[PDB]
Amino acid sequence: GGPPQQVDQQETWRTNFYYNDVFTWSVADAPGSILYTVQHSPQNNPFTAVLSQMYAGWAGGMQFRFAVAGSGAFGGRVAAAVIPPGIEIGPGLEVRQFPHVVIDARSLEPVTNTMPDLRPNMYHPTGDPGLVPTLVLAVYNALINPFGGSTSAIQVTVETRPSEDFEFVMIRAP
Amino acid sequence: GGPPQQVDQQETWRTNFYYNDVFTWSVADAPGSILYTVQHSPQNNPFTAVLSQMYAGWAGGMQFRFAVAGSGAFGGRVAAAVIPPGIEIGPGLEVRQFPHVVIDARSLEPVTNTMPDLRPNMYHPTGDPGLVPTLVLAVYNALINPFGGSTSAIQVTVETRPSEDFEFVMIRAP
């Protein structure tokens, strides 16, 4: 591999969180189900996406932040774990024994989970990255609404940020 | 330009927040809509407004503070970003990839956003300021009321303050 090419962190991007995706959390979800399966790719942050268009190859982790738009009178948690590569993702993947964080439905402050680059190589090529970690937001205790009515489908907004070790390795035609 | 003319910060004004405007947040708002579009002008703080009557020309940023008058059983967030000048403001302006802050509906403490003076020049003339930043309070996750009733139109009060770099440059007839 080559030298790092996104050094000098203080550059707005990689120091601030930007929107990645939004997923809905339902009351009728079974408490072991899987929502928001995402893969370690540079197509999560848009500035990271356009510099991955610029560069050939990337390395380093990505910092994920979850903001829940739910009322204070809600219950149930979400479990977020960084699944190792090589482990099959699907039904029966029990998430709660991985190193995980707990995200409340009535959480005022956003919960941040660091997703490192668990890779056998130095870098992931842009055309074919190879073995990459997977971030899984499995439910930990289902949503409970003690009211009854139309409000049963609150949603969580995922915010993303490159970490301190994220950097591109080789430049190419943008 | 000339020297700064509102040095020695500790002067009550510019160290305390004062009311600027109030806007309403509705349940039926689409979650990408725009509320409270404001422009970087000295006609936001009243003491700043009367010294802009006193002086000719101004420079430096302004500190914005938002206080949400909503119940603890509300959901949904607000996104506040400082839009650069030169960028058109309207429908389709996607705010969530700008450097932004997240304001909860059930936030106990007020959320403060610093709006810097992004200017090509040294100062903005009072008659014609030129290129100025724009503060946009776009919605991030719509309001959800799990009750049903007359309460669907809570409102947010904007408080304003000159920053540490705000200062007037030239004096004129007040």
Place this chain on the structure above:
Amino acid sequence: GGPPQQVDQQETWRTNFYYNDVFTWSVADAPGSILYTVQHSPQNNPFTAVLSQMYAGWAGGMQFRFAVAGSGAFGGRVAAAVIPPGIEIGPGLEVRQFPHVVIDARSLEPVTNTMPDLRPNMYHPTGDPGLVPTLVLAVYNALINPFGGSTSAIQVTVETRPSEDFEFVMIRAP
């Protein structure tokens, strides 16, 4: 004037808050109305009242503390400002551009506002104090109850305390 005569602060009184008055906050209040207009007098703390019976003349500020007995599912704020003497108090007194504090309806911790002695003289005589500041608790965003029912008239309890600069000047017949 004479020397200070309530030095050595650590004396229980002036270091602890004691009850002064209680006022009600209604849902149907207009959001610019005025509740709890109080005047800078020693007849706010009872120990201060009986030493004002003891002494002739007083100086120094008073520390005001507000405890709101409201539910966590309430909205709306209260604005507390120390109005300067010489300024007329009534309808149309816009409070939000004075140096103020914001008190939530669902505030867990009491909000404390320091009310200084803004006086032209050294001391205020007990018989006629002269120009004194006025503490005004104007509403900032009206009360919103998303339930509907009998609960619309929550109340706030004012607690008072002499400040660090409060002291009596001359002794007389108690």
Place this chain on the structure above:
Amino acid sequence: GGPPQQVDQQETWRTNFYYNDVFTWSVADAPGSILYTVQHSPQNNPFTAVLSQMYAGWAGGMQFRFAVAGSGAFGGRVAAAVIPPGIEIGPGLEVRQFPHVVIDARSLEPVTNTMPDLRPNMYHPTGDPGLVPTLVLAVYNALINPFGGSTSAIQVTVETRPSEDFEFVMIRAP
């Protein structure tokens, strides 16, 4: 009272003289008469006037400068004294035994008289200032024109400036 709120003198205003009033000096004036009776108020300098609109209460003196638009072939002087408050102003007020300055009719350079804040209190309220000094420009030796003709009514222009101790004490609605 409160802290000073117009510290850091070097601010153009209070370091430069600005026009206040103009009064005429006639040949036929009796040599003990009184022209230009002014009172110690912030409505003498316009920047001081608009910050007195901004603030509530003021303290400190004001620096007065007189520029006489008279020929070099004129005679007679003007006497400028700062009359203490409590002293009645009218006919019979003999000015020449107060601490005074002498202003010539043919004076090339402007004559500056410092008018201090002779006050019993800490500050003067904006609505009612109380006891204030009075600047009286009494004549010392009447105008003599050795020519004879239409030129007998030369005029003096008063210029004003806040002094080093002038400062506002409390802020209010501008």
Place this chain on the structure above:
Amino acid sequence: GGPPQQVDQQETWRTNFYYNDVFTWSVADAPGSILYTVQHSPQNNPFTAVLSQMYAGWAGGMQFRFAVAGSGAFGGRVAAAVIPPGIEIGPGLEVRQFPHVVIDARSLEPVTNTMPDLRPNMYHPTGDPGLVPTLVLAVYNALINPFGGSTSAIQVTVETRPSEDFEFVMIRAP
């Protein structure tokens, strides 16, 4: 912008005053009228004019000197202020509250007024300078001739000099 290109002041030009314009002062002028409205341009000093032919772009102020050719038996003053750009120049422009200097009709020594470069940019282009200050010589107390006769139209000669901060930025075809 580029580096300064008229450094090393001691070069005769910019250290000595040279003639710019001459204007007449009449007895029948109203005492608020405007004479000699000039604009901040390099076409005021002739050496500055030919190096502005040499160079492309300029910055820095200009030092203005006024020599009045009037008798010692004349009265009335002239007021010279540097009007900020953005302020409209015409009838009703009250000059006496700008930072100004007072020029006597019988002044032996010339009165010098420094006219700084109040600009939003780094430099003024030669083809289009943009926002520039304006020097206005408004009358302060009208001319009075106590004689009566043909002498009522004395004139003032303006002398100009580049200041210490005046310098050109970019060279072009002279």
